[PDB]
Amino acid sequence: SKGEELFTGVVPILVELDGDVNGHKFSVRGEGEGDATNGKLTLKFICTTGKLPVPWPTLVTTLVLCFSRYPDHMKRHDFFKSAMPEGYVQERTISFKDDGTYKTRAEVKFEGDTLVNRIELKGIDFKEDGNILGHKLEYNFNSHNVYITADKQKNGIKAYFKIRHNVEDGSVQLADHYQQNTPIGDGPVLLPDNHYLSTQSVLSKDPNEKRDHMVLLEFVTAAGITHGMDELY
Amino acid sequence: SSKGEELFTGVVPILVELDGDVNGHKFSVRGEGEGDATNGKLTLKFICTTGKLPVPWPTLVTTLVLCFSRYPDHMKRHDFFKSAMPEGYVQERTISFKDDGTYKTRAEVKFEGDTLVNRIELKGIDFKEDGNILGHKLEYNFNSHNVYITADKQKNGIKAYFKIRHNVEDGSVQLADHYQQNTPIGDGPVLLPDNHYLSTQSVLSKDPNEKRDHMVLLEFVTAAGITHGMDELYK
Ligand SMILES: [Cl-]
């Protein structure tokens, strides 16, 4: 795609999220940069409305898969970069086991030289003293796989994965992610064969930042394409 | 699928000790940190305990614990590195810097109590006086790579090959070919794998509180390249 050429260097990123969970509103703004050749992202997020009413780890997946490292042999299967520069809509339902649900809608696109992710998030049916609204999640993150398949009828993709959030008592809070992406433009996009992305995330704090915030390093790498060749062999 | 796998289900402390000699320039490095194999994650800080490193930090990354790789459930029977524990394995490499010299390394990786220890000797020869390595012309960063692995039935271990791409300060790339062998230290049985690869990603940084010559490293290593029937069914 012509879109993949936009990612050959380090690209600045802007993230803007407006959220409402059980009526608790908040906004998050993030900035940083992405290096898709190595599949690497670094960002700092601030809650601009004061205190975040949910744990930061619950927002990581919502807060730019166009920065995934796609191996040379799998370039034809990178939908995210192929939709650029006009971009794509990413929508999810995230179901927290035994608790509430987030519904998200994001637009990911270039504005000038910057890759912007603008998100609206609505959360409902959370327990006021559950793991989420009770802030019982550890400030850390696990490695996951994002499973991707084409959705020809929407000219896009679907994905599924299950996030594991460590809870302060030693338990694990599961969050099922149901995802769809569709291009914003009408130009042609690449629809992939089935594959997955391996993800790793590291969360930290800036010691000179007084606002409620999260520093994030993330790696995302594509794998799992069965070429006819090795299916033969 | 091995007993050794059980030693890696949580966070394991790591100690790394390296003695090096590159064209007669001697040095030592000590590293400490921890590994979380469930997530394929390593966090370490290394100090050059002899003062200044005579080679670029990036050239030592690969030498300075693949037992911390995340193997997917369906590939756990191919995890040689964990299966050799706790007695451990010897890891040897020849690393050829294209158009420059060579490192030869020998390391023992094993548990000493609750700590996973990597103790290494490195000898470097034939480096060019004008070159990217002794000239310190390499950027302080690292790229993502694939480590290719195959069984070595004759030595009851494995062999590996990969090509590291080091960014050079003028925009070129300095290649480093890695040839690797691993063999178990103990007698116990080990898992000999089908061909596969490890996908690696690394971030180099500095600790603002540390005034010694040092490198902070975060790394992710995940096994791949062996498919499973449920994934293939729907392709
Ligand atoms: Cl250096």
Numbering used by the authors:
A (entry chain B): 2 to 64, 68 to 237
B (entry chain A): 1 to 64, 68 to 238
From the paper:
GFP is a small, folded protein and the entirety of the β-barrel structure is required for chromophore formation and fluorescence. Recently, we applied Cellular High-throughput Encapsulation, Solubilisation and Screening (CHESS)-based directed evolution to superfolder GFP (sfGFP) and identified a GFP variant, termed ultra-stable GFP (usGFP), with superior stability when subjected to SDS and high temperatures.
The crystal structure of usGFP was solved at 1.9 Å resolution in order to probe the structural basis of increased stability. L69 of usGFP was situated in the core of the β-barrel, making direct contact with the chromophore. Thus, improved hydrophobic packing in this region due to the Q69L mutation may be responsible, in part, for the increased stability of usGFP. In sfGFP, a water molecule occupies a cavity in the vicinity of the Q69 side chain within the protein. In contrast, the usGFP structure shows no electron density in the equivalent position, indicating that this water molecule is absent. The N164Y mutation of usGFP was located on the outer surface of the β-barrel on β-strand 8, and participated in crystal contacts via van der Waals interactions with G232 from the C-terminal α-helix of neighbouring, symmetry related molecules. The side chain hydroxyl group of the substituted residue, Y164, of usGFP formed intramolecular hydrogen bonds with the side chains of K166 and D180. Examination of the interface between the two molecules of the asymmetric unit of usGFP showed that this created a buried surface area of 823 Å2 (7.7% total surface area), determined using PISA20.
